[PDB]
Amino acid sequence: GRMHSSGKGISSSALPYSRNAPSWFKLSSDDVVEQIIKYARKGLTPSQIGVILRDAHGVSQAKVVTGNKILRILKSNGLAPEIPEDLYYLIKKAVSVRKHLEKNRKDKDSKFRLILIESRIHRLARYYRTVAVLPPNWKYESATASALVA
Amino acid sequence: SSKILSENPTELELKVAQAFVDLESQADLKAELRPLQFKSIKEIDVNGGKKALAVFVPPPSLQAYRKVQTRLTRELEKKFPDRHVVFLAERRILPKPARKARKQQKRPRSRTLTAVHDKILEDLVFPTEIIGKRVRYLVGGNKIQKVLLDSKDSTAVDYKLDSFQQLYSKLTGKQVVFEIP
Amino acid sequence: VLVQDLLHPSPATEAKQHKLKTLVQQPRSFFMDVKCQGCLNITTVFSHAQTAVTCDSCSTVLCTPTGGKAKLTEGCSFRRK
Amino acid sequence: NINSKLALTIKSGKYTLGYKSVVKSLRTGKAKLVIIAANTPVLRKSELEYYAMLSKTPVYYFQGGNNELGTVCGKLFRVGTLSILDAGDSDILSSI
Amino acid sequence: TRTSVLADALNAINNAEKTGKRQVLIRPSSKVIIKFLTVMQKHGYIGEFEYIDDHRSGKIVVQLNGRLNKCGVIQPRFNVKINDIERWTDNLLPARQFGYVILTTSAGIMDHEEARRKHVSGKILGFVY
Numbered sequence: 001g002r003m004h005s006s007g008k009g010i011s012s013s014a015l016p017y018s019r020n021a022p023s024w025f026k027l028s029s030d031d032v033v034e035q036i037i038k039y040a041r042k043g044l045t046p047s048q049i050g051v052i053l054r055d056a057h058g059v060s061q062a063k064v065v066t067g068n069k070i071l072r073i074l075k076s077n078g079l080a081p082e083i084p085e086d087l088y089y090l091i092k093k094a095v096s097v098r099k100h101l102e103k104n105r106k107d108k109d110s111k112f113r114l115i116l117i118e119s120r121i122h123r124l125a126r127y128y129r130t131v132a133v134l135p136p137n138w139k140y141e142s143a144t145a146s147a148l149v150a
Numbered sequence: 151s152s153k154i155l156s157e158n159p160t161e162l163e164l165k166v167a168q169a170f171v172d173l174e175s176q177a178d179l180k181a182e183l184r185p186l187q188f189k190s191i192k193e194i195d196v197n198g199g200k201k202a203l204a205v206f207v208p209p210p211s212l213q214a215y216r217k218v219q220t221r222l223t224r225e226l227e228k229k230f231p232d233r234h235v236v237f238l239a240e241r242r243i244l245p246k247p248a249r250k251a252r253k254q255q256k257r258p259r260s261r262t263l264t265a266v267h268d269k270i271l272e273d274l275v276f277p278t279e280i281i282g283k284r285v286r287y288l289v290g291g292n293k294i295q296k297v298l299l300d301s302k303d304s305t306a307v308d309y310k311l312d313s314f315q316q317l318y319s320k321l322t323g324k325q326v327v328f329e330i331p
Numbered sequence: 332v333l334v335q336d337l338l339h340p341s342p343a344t345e346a347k348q349h350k351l352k353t354l355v356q357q358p359r360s361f362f363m364d365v366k367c368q369g370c371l372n373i374t375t376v377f378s379h380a381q382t383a384v385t386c387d388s389c390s391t392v393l394c395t396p397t398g399g400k401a402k403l404t405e406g407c408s409f410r411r412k
Numbered sequence: 413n414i415n416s417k418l419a420l421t422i423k424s425g426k427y428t429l430g431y432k433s434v435v436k437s438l439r440t441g442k443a444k445l446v447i448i449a450a451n452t453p454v455l456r457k458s459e460l461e462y463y464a465m466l467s468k469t470p471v472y473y474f475q476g477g478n479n480e481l482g483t484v485c486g487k488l489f490r491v492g493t494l495s496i497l498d499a500g501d502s503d504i505l506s507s508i
Numbered sequence: 509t510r511t512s513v514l515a516d517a518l519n520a521i522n523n524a525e526k527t528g529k530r531q532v533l534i535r536p537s538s539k540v541i542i543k544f545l546t547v548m549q550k551h552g553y554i555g556e557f558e559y560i561d562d563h564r565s566g567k568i569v570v571q572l573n574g575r576l577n578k579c580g581v582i583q584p585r586f587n588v589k590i591n592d593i594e595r596w597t598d599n600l601l602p603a604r605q606f607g608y609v610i611l612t613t614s615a616g617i618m619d620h621e622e623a624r625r626k627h628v629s630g631k632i633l634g635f636v637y
């Protein structure tokens with residue numbers, strides 16, 4: 001495990017055996033979608049929408065209630081971001097490290113971490129291009145990354 | 151006979167719909183039993199002198215039946231004694247295409263035989279929910295499924311289960327065992 | 332021990348196992364009904380909540396996130412669903 | 413944090429970028445907030461906040477120059493000042 | 509990463525039979541694994557086995573009877589013509605009178621004698637004796 005480390009951590013979520021909604025869930029499959037779209041317009045990405053839903057609304061999984069995954073619902077309503085969320089956060093972190101490097105040039109560790117982060121961007125961006133999530137001509141440029149995230 | 155979505159219903163199909171035109175009499179459950187419809191009623195004999203009643207329903211109408219099925223099963227089984235009532239949707243199974251077969255549109259997984267049989271086995275035990283399935287592969291060669299059910303609402307089916315296994319055997323040819331741990 | 336019922340573990344030792352190492356992995360977390368002391372309003376809160384959930388009536392924090400289970404503030408009572 | 417808050421306004425709300433549009437937006441009273449870059453000249457700055465004083469408009473002093481303010485707004489050019497006419501999905505007006 | 513679930517499956521059985529255990533839990537399951545065990549079970553080298561549903565690849569519990577000397581996979585799954593099967597049985601099996609090489613052919617997963625009876629060949633998949 002751990003593409004860019006020696007770690008072998010196994011921490012993750014354990015989905016329940018049941019694929020049906022809990023008996024106590026009373027909200028409809030409708031009421032959740034407007035709740036999901038409402039939070040997406042607040043600027044929340046699908047990961048942070050799902051955490052708030054279970055944290056504050058008792059929605060254990062949006063799929064067992066609505067029937068579709070959360071990002072699939074935004075994409076059906078024209079609210080899917082152009083860059084997928086995980087790739088955006090990889091690029092945003094890489095932007096942040098380089099801005100720190102430009103002020104601290106002797107931070108040789110940060111230069112090393114930046115190479116790992118950007119390599120992770122190119123491998124994932126290459127995947128998003130084969131599946132036509134990104135344009136075939138989409139390429140990550142270090143100079144113009146700040147425009148995309150800032 | 152307007153309740154039945156099939157041409158030339160059998161006499162048994164008419165009687166069940168005749169029951170269907172009598173339970174809306176109490177208005178607590180009247181505002182929703184009018185749109186409910188079904189296509190066929192396949193009936194088989196289980197051991198002990200009882201008879202199994204399988205109600206076949208168009209798949210889009212199932213979620214409407216589930217709102218009153220808990221009530222509806224207890225009263226229709228009283229009206230028809232020594233009858234075990236389950237509600238199944240007549241899902242369609244598309245055979246797996248052969249290697250040299252002419253290309254058709256991609257078969258969705260919900261139309262596959264494993265998924266449909268997993269579904270009728272779940273519609274069979276509606277009041278309860280499935281908490282686990284195991285499959286033993288005995289040395290003789292035959293295979294037996296085991297289904298473990300949740301104790302909530304167990305009282306609606308806990309006296310049957312044996313009717314379900316033989317009814318499932320009728321539909322699939324496989325052996326199943328229902329267990330409430 | 333060479334001969335053992337792997338299919339029927341003792342439920343006591345099955346519960347001490349890590350959550351991913353049971354026969355079928357099952358989360359040990361749950362959802363709660365939080366009664367704030369100030370008013371009476373059912374608010375469904377995840378046991379391991381990452382959000383400082385606030386009830387609709389008064390903008391008062393019901394729970395504060397920790398490393399693991401969220402810690403409910405004083406006067407808030409929970410009942411597991 | 414406010415850069416992220418301001419970014420939501422650029423995506424969803426309404427704005428004008430630049431000194432000439434900002435002073436016009438202060439004249440019509442349609443400006444909700446005026447954002448000024450750190451390297452903006454004091455003469456232009458003390459005049460923007462005198463217009464805002466007459467217009468009763470809050471001023472936020474961005475800590476960066478006109479190069480960093482432009483890229484926060486998702487632009488590839490420099491923005492010395494901008495006015496938020498309609499904060500949309502954001503709560504920037506409630507966060508000063 | 510995990511490149512062959514059948515190799516992993518037989519290794520857990522192989523180590524338990526050598527240590528004398530009479531049962532093994534296998535994770536994850538697959539069609540090839542299940543059919544490999546049925547061939548071993550049909551010839552009596554293992555007992556009853558159980559498939560556990562976790563809404564995932566699955567799990568298996570196998571009962572071992574102590575009669576199994578060794579079962580294993582052959583990676584890669586070499587292409588085997590019918591006349592090449594003899595060379596494979598000579599190299600892999602202890603004698604000419606017992607033991608089986610399991611092949612996956614278009615006629616199904618089967619031992620080398622069943623494969624000779626029905627006159628088909630495919631890719632070698634493993635062995636048992």
Ligand SMILES: [Mg+2]
Nearest residue numbers: 001008009010
């Ligand atoms: Mg690992």
Ligand SMILES: [Mg+2]
Nearest residue numbers: 002003004005
């Ligand atoms: Mg590597």
Ligand SMILES: [Zn+2]
Nearest residue numbers: 367370386389
């Ligand atoms: Zn409250």
